[PDB]
Ligand binder design. Sequence first.
Ligand SMILES: Cc1oc(-c2ccccc2)nc1CCOc1cccc2cccnc12
Ligand SMILES: [Mg+2]
Ligand SMILES: [Zn+2]
Length: 313
Amino acid sequence: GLMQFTLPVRLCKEIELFHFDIGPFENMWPGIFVYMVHRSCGTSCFELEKLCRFIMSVKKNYRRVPYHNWKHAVTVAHCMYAILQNNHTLFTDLERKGLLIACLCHDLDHRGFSNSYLQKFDHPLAALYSTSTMEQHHFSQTVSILQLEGHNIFSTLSSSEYEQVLEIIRKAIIATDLALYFGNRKQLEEMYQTGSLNLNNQSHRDRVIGLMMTACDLCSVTKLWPVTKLTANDIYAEFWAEGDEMKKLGIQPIPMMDRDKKDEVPQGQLGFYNAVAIPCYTTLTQILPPTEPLLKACRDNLSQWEKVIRGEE
Ligand SMILES: Cc1oc(-c2ccccc2)nc1CCOc1cccc2cccnc12
Ligand SMILES: [Mg+2]
Ligand SMILES: [Zn+2]
């Protein structure tokens, strides 16, 4: 009960900042996550024995893909930790529990391929789940792991609290389907601007949590430039693998996934920042003012990509 995780001084301080990088030492990432649950939630939220066994089963069920790996899971959970900590009183006890777990599980058993590639391959998962194919799989894998003997970290919740938390985790994971983000943000934009936004409206909270999930999931674009630049290598390593597999099915991939069109990356990153990233962190900063450092970091990185195009790097 009296057993805290404590990080070295530099990590203790930097972990509170949005732009924190969890570093190259995989064996510290579990402790970093537990530390975040303890400060975000309390040291009583979860039985440490059960949490540790849940964390290690989740790790085991992430694959060795260049980007959609265990490091991404923990990176995305840290961004959620930073949002929750800077917005203390806006979130219920259950929401804080559910969202950190949702972020850790959000890409469980990812194979490094998009929903589009699964559908064109005619993968069995595409027959079982016609939309948000991988996201329904990620939630399915999360429930499976929760049902292993000794892995039910929620066991001390009432029946109805348990139903609410799994419902938060499901919506949270489904919302990481980027195809759903555009509509979700347009709606939140309209509600904020016409003043109809109401955080006691459960349907409104769902939407806001959805946007937080998109913000955490894209948080690669909110790190310091060298982290952002080196993560883009991993992101494109998966895309180009998928493009190779499209060509094997006799389908020219979109240029984003064609390794023959590496030259067009800087312009592709610009469009992505302008069409997805900047709009996401702007609407998030309007709804939750203390998340502005994410918008500011994103704008810095947009400017760094503009500099790449102008041959200045
Ligand atoms: C779809 C996507 O997602 C991310 C990303 C996702 C999460 C964090 C950081 C970046 N980056 C992208 C790249 C969007 O880039 C692109 C978009 C469109 C055409 C392109 C042509 C060549 C190269 N890139 C391109
Ligand atoms: Mg995903
Ligand atoms: Zn993800």
